[model samples]
Target: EDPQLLVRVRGGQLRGIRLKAPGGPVSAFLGIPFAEPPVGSRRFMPPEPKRPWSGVLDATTFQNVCYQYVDTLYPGFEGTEMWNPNRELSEDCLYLNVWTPYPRPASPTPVLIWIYGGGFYSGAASLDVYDGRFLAQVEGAVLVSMNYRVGTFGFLALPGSREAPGNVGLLDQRLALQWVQENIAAFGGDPMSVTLFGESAGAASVGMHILSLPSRSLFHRAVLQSGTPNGPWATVSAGEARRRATLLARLVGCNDTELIACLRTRPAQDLVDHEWHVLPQESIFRFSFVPVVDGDFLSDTPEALINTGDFQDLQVLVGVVKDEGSYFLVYGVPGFSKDNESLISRAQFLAGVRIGVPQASDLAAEAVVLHYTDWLHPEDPTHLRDAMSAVVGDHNVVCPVAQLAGRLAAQGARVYAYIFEHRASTLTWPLWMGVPHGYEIEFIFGLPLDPSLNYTTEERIFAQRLMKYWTNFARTGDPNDPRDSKSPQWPPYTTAAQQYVSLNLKPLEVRRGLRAQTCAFWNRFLPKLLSAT
Candidate 1:
């Protein structure tokens, strides 16, 4: 009940709030500025450090969420959990929040910095899905989440010019990490024991920062959930980025000599309002604005760099679901479960099936049907539809993720991998998880629910164990090192074993291989020619 939870740090005195929670007197320091507001000519510049404040600042309320468009059609998935656009919107939304079990722990505790992913187009630290309290309270760790510029404001790359070299959004994330390094200790966190993690674009971001020379020492451990840096939608060539930027400049009536300046003068919303449909998704990669290989922040293609062992040797834990493409299927495919057509029927299903693997010819489409006949049981349509999701997931997320884990482990990183198979989306269809992409949050964050919508006792234990596994990894880069026998000893991924943990509700299981036939097909796709007729 005390408003006097003042914490002193780099900038000034921040008066935080003490919450009445399961954690003994949890202290929440919300909306602390990590960087100066990016406004005026500073719009596209790398994030500037926040200036010192004079008086004890109120850190109770969240900063205004960064500007993002609301998709009335698909508000993202897993129980239709979407960010409230009604939440305050602003260009000056670069802020971070912290939650600690102890106002001042006897010793600095491990830190978990969570970065959200909305395809690099939308998302903020203030969203309910990203709340760090449960993770902090149960895990006895300090947790932090932050907002960075999104869409064109953060990723619009200029033509070989430092004026707007693009990756400012990623730079914003790095600056937040720097803030953690410089200020977390004051909040009872060990800067050296930081674990940076996220899902989708955020996972890809953790991958990028791992490869980035500037971000190596920012965090000691990383988790890449359902994504990697070199994914089709995550990177844009400099040429493509410049073209998009030029179009944005022209659309804002800044087609003049000082286009950059004029573009800067235009309101931030004007740029966000541009018919993003103008740069619509090409079936393969959906996001319009995304990260690019700016020679500075992102030096080379992640795969290429990883091949030569160019990254810092940090401990990594990467994972995907049993059906990673179900989210894509649920949103895009009309006949996925309803079964308007047989999946093997080229004409009936071809168009709708173009999401996971796009631009296939009538002939190439046949290969998909040929390759994944196991996924289609026409006699039982439900069985048939579920298999289709499996095929799509393998081709899209599962295959790529396996290769990434294998490559990382080969390159001498302490790597662990998993396939999350728990069907925890009880709010949706029973097959909701299948297991779906981004659906693990329900278990990982242990988000509390209404008594009417409460998860079963089995699920409660699963969520708690999931939390233990994640927090254990954060503490020692080893999920096996848990408080007690309640949490299973998660095995590490080795070349011979290629071991991966099966994340489930009743218990945690470790397997030596996963989807071998399917993953092998993809990993060998490039090497084996289409065929000579």
Candidate 2:
């Protein structure tokens, strides 16, 4: 019956909606524009600040989503499901949403900014999975979610397109953080105490931010889930990205000249269709529109930068899911009736592993299959699943994350690592993708349990404990503080102890031997394996 609190942002005055809990109060402001729309002449350029508006712009509904490729590779994420029912895809989608437990006049709370991941291609802030209401009201922290350009609109690099080259999407993320620093205090958030957290491409973006001078002093801490710095597929060279762009342009019926503008005006759906045809699902590891090591935004490779003590002062939490590559095998592994040797030959050729000798590629592939089989599926007499997971996971997730931890640990930075082993029951049949990619999101954020996932009452309670640990880490540098009484004791990672906490379906526990064995294998061969490319 009371009027909602109102405040004047850069553009207009917005009435913040109040959220009443059982006995507490919360406030939320959705669809807040951070930048002007990236359309027409402004397309493919750096995000321009939005102009001030005269009247109060409605802050109720979410803004339009950026143009993105239709992801047919993954089920439950295609066609209408991929498109937000509430919001339509458009060029004018540079907005952010904020949720706070209390209004600006109340006590300042720590802020956690979330960046969604879709291979730098397709994702939205309005996904049901990313609802920040629980995190804000229950965890008592300010939660912010924002949208940026994706797919060709985001990372399709072309010659002479330096105005907004390689990683415009990443730059957009930094801009949103800048907005938070300036305006979060108005929403009951501590501007100086912010933690940037993301998974997959989002995690990689956070990693890049740690390396960029422009991103320095933006956030106090970082959380990288299933993302890492070192790995052949993590960061692309400018030349390689440009070549891919050229190929993509041809796929879209465009040439080198005016390709940037031409592709800008082309229908978004057409580009998505073209990508599906030109690049098969299997080539995602080699041909996805990922972040490029453009000498500007990403000056050097994250590995080289971290090796030089680039992020020594920052507190970092990095980890991966247990079966990190199971999804890749399901989507990318071709149905071939070949023996292990022949399969390795095809895989090596596909991976582009040509070095000293003619047999170098085959050996590299063999090493990959063997490593994955040994680490992921040791019990299985056959190395089929392990080889598939290894080839995809190492290139995309594990190698990058482990290399990041190793580099940062070498510099004496306070780094914490973990592995998610909570396999949901929703996984059916042969797809025993234990705790597959992105499954940790539901547990880490303490989302409402899906009955189909077969989470019992105790498992639900355990998820809450995990959320407490994560939020505590976001609040302070360490997750093992005495304040986190319910969560298990988590220790900072060191080469000597080789310690890591495993977040299984139950209580968290320190698994030192498993950590030591995995680290030993990764440390010994990851670099050499990476070099084979």
Candidate 3:
């Protein structure tokens, strides 16, 4: 019945729905197929753009999610469960959704594309937490999200086969971007002013897009939250990817000659079930499938690419939460469980170190353990627990993000760095977590705008400011654009100055050098220590 909801995209004419949000009513187009379903013979292969259709397609309802094992690290924990997919699962799931302000702005607005994160194995764009209605209505930007395959269905890599050269999931994201370039204009968006943003694995994917030469022109600006391509767990070597693929085939009852063929015939759920069996799940960092440098998607390592100046030169916004490890701490160290309310003992911490970094030599591992031990309270169980949590957070996320921001600054790119410091009032986890990974997501999406969620007055004000900053960045390369004269200027980050914003409710502080000493220990000292061993 609404004329504004009808849009003619490259695939066909689509009819969307309108929902009342924060600022006003917004038009949302859900489940628009960007690529043909990668099913049957096309499984594990790069995606193909969708073929044009004749009739108007119904774009009001969300479609099926990609195949994945649906379980959080800590069962019944809302923090983790909030991110799991709530839709039916299927292989035919390469779709994208878009949200735009109603009545249409007089001029085209910036487009912000979001990529969800789930450690490269589990995630969905259909999660209610990511609904873009409020972001479009309040922030005044066109927001888009695409559903890409995850787990074994997305990252399976075979060594010599052209049909499955790996990084197919990354390829899926690329095709979606290409779709955006061709069709976003119809929704009152500017393709030239696109900002790609994501969190955790999604953030890492954004970094990967920057490093990738083929994907450079699809987007102009980037926001990497709590992850980077250089993170230790962000990728595996091509050799390792192939080895895992072969192992997966064997597990699914396939031989070498017919590996890809036999595995293709197996049920999708079977492959997802057997993937976790490929590696030990003792450490939270352990993942069965992730992105790989298959020479096509990524020609070299992230370090090699950075050294040779093979990355994009666009403006970047990168950051991490204060206590990224606390969420992982829900599972506790490798040997412990969340049910054990007691603090982690020194012995358990040592075991966790060994399991988490199995490749480090005895000397290197001992040094790492000592580095994390609390000097003031050496025998205190609570301090030990906090120490272990720091190790997980620093090693997995914080240090890597700092390294990424610094490298981008060094390479002559404008970089804005931030550290989310606010703890949610609705947290069901332990208080010591401070602010764990993915905590900033709700605020970024403007959840506080909904009073029914019971957000404090301060949180609501802060959330509004956060949305303004994000949308401002999307419009121009600067977060302070159109100048909110009252807000403090977010200084540009450089290797020398190292200025960054600490995001929270009480007055926004422009701090200098984020996690300086801790990052140096991981980015500098540890590498030097491991090289000699």
TM-scores for candidates 1 onward, in order: 0.90, 0.86, 0.96
| Model 3 stretches astray by more than 4 angstroms | 72-76, 255-257, 310-312, 332-342
Model 2 TM-score (2 dp): 0.86
RMSD of 2: 4.7
Which prediction has more favorable TM-score, 1 or 3?
3
Q: Looking at model 1, how many pairs of residues clash?
A: 1
Predictions in order: lDDT:
0.75, 0.69, 0.84
User: What is the per-residue lDDT of model 1 for residues 286-377, given as tens digits with 9 covering 90 to 100?
Assistant: 66678887777777887677777633366998898776765666456655432233233433344544555553545555666667655445
Local accuracy of candidate 3 as per-residue lDDT tens digits, 397-511: 8888888888888888899999999998977666777788888998999988887888898898888888888988898888885745656788988899999998998766888
Worst 10 residues of 3 by lDDT: 329-338
Tell me, by TM-score, which candidate is best. 3
* Candidate 2 residue 24 C-alpha distance from true site, Å: 5.9
- What's model 3's lDDT at 523? 88
Better of 1 and 2 by lDDT: 1
